[PDB]
RNA sequence: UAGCUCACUGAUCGAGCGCUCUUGCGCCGAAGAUGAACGGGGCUAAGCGGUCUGCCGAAGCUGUGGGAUGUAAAAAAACAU
């Protein structure tokens, strides 16, 4: 069972997130955002990586 | 010739009715050659007028980002394109 666990792993349990979602306006489009997830948008002018 | 019948009149019946226009929408006039042939299915509105209010609808206008050309002679920032 150590071998058969190594080579055929069981699906791990899902990471915890809050049960919540929002609908937010960015660059005049509306996205549904759930926390922990990344989305694509219009360039935000004057935004730097790690902001 | 006769004969039938009409115009007109008396009577009966008891509440409307005559001849005129004129709008709107229809009917007939209207019939071809490969096969519904007029978008289709269908609809008495899901057709036609008139009025009220919602919505859909484009590469138009707005929103958020990039480019370029002209001002213009470095940029950057404007405006226009
Ligand atoms: Mg006769
Ligand atoms: Mg025929
Ligand atoms: Mg039709
Ligand atoms: Mg109408
Ligand atoms: Mg459009
Ligand atoms: Mg285009
Ligand atoms: Mg375009
Ligand atoms: Mg335009
Ligand atoms: Mg622009
Ligand atoms: Mg330029
Ligand atoms: Mg220029
Ligand atoms: Mg120049």
Q: What is the DSSP string of A1-51?
A: -HHHHHHSPPPPPPPP--S--EEEEETTEEEEE-TT-----SPPTT--S--
Distance A48 CA to ligand 7 centre (A): 28
As a whole number of angstroms, the distance between CA A27 and CA A21 comes to: 19
Residues 2-31 of chain A within 7 A of strand B, judged by CB, are 27-29
As a whole number of angstroms, the distance between CA A26 and CA A11 comes to: 36
A45 and A51 in contact (C-beta within 8 Å)?
no
As a whole number of angstroms, the distance between CA A30 and CA A8 comes to: 42
Q: Is the CB of A46 under 7 A from strand B?
A: no
Polymer length in residues for chain A: 51
Experimental method: cryo-EM
């Amino acid at each position: 069972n150590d071998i058969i666990n190594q080579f055929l792993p069981k699906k791990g349990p899902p990471p915890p997130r809050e049960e919540i979602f929002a609908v937010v306006v960015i660059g005049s489009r509306q996205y549904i955002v759930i926390p922990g997830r990344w989305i694509y948008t219009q360039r935000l002018k004057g935004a730097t990586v790690n902001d």
